[PDB]
Design a protein around this ligand. Structure first.
Ligand SMILES: [Zn+2]
Length: 423
């Protein structure tokens, strides 16, 4: 029943299957890192991410006069075995919390089914996997074996609080925007969280509040998983598409813009900043990309490798994209089924909806200002549970989000930095 069937310990001996040393296709060299496969198609690497981007391998903080407003550095974080063990347990716990809700189960199911499309071959008659959608696993005999995967959760790079969902690009194909999809790497940490203010006028003001309430890390991870969903089905909105924030005088005076991809991901009223015309443009655009995939599958007659048959993969993608098949064995995209899937991934899976499911207090909009970053420890059950997060039932933290109240539940939060006023 649990999303993660085994309670991994960082020091568990490697087995070359679900506990192994691996290398990622960063187009560069790297020493293998210990990784854990927590569920079909999903791996966790308890390391700071100095791998996905070669230009971001230094964790040391730049000079104090060169650091930005909202940022937090600690070159030593996640460097010890005890930390990696806690990281692993914290991340698995958040996956369980997410999976325990119907929405999370739906999202995670969609993610597992969202296998990156096999469009790496130059011959339109043959289907071939794109190697950057795989990782290289060291087997018991010391040799490497290629394994396809959909998601990797890895520690943050230099700036500990800069969580994000990234993936390896293609020389010509825009994998996260052409319906293909690609393996997603989420920079994330369950050992820190952010503060926000309960009053909207305060939360959206850069000069007020210290961050009285703490964001539930499960929402934060879910937010990243939502991006992953968009990217795995190749329907992420181009980051150049932004909303000129004109509903907040403080954003305006700085010309701050926010991508539609972020507004969509948050959901709620934020999503309404993307007008009907533009929303239609995107929907039709991705509908066509799905059509191209359906045709590519029709033009397929061969397949590379023996890890599966042409017929097996054609079906695996028929399932992912929910395609239809006529008597002649041809695939096509059904408008109803497409709109349903597209809407599921973009409107049903949103931060705002996860808040409703977790029954937690959370920022009301993405268009606010950061307040502070806290150090936390969600692994101990006396601190945080799969079922209630910080608001432990049958305790003084059960009601009114008392568990997220950093003033009431002060023993669970250590403020590391305040961001208010620095903007
Ligand atoms: Zn985001």
């Amino acid at each position: 029943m649990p999303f993660v069937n085994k309670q991994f310990n960082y020091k568990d001996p490697v087995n070359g299957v679900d506990i192994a040393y691996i290398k990622i296709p960063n187009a560069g060299q790297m020493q293998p890192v210990k990784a854990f496969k927590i569920h079909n198609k999903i791996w966790v690497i308890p390391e700071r991410d100095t791998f996905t981007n070669p230009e971001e391998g230094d964790l040391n903080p730049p000079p104090e006069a060169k650091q930005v407003p909202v940022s937090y550095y600690d070159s030593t974080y996640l460097s010890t075995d005890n930390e990696k063990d806690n990281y692993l347990k914290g991340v698995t716990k958040l996956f369980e919390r997410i999976y325990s809700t119907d929405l999370g189960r739906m999202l995670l199911t969609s993610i597992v089914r969202g296998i990156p499309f096999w469009g790496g071959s130059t011959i339109d008659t043959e289907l071939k996997v794109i190697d950057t959608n795989c990782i290289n696993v060291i087997q018991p005999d010391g040799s490497y074996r290629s394994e396809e995967l959909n998601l990797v959760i890895i520690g943050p790079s230099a700036d500990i609080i800069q969580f994000e969902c990234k993936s390896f690009g293609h020389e010509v194909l825009n994998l996260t925007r052409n319906g293909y999809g690609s393996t997603q790497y989420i920079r994330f940490s369950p050992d820190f969280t952010f503060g926000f203010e309960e009053s909207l006028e305060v939360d959206t003001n850069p000069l007020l509040g210290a961050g009285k309430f703490a964001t539930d890390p499960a929402v934060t991870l879910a937010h990243e998983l939502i991006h992953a969903g968009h990217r795995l089905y190749g329907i992420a909105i181009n980051p150049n598409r932004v909303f000129k924030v004109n509903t907040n005088a403080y954003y305006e005076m700085s010309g701050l813009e926010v991508s539609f991809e972020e507004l969509r991901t948050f959901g709620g009223h934020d999503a309404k900043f993307i007008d009907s015309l533009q929303e239609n443009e995107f929907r039709l655009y991705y509908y066509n990309k799905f059509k191209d995939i359906a045709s590519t599958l029709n033009k397929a007659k061969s397949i590379v490798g023996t890890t599966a048959s042409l017929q097996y993969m054609k079906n695996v993608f028929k399932e992912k994209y929910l395609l239809s098949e006529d008597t002649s064995g041809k695939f096509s995209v059904d408008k109803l089924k497409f709109d349903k899937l597209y809407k599921m991934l973009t409107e049903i899976y949103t931060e705002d909806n996860f808040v409703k499911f977790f029954k937690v207090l959370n920022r009301k909009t993405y268009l606010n200002f950061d307040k502070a970053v806290f150090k936390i420890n969600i692994v101990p059950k006396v601190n945080y549970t799969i079922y209630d997060g910080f608001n432990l039932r049958n305790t003084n933290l059960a009601a009114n989000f008392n568990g997220q109240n950093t003033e009431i539940n002060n023993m669970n939060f250590t403020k590391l930095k305040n961001f208010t006023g620095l903007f």
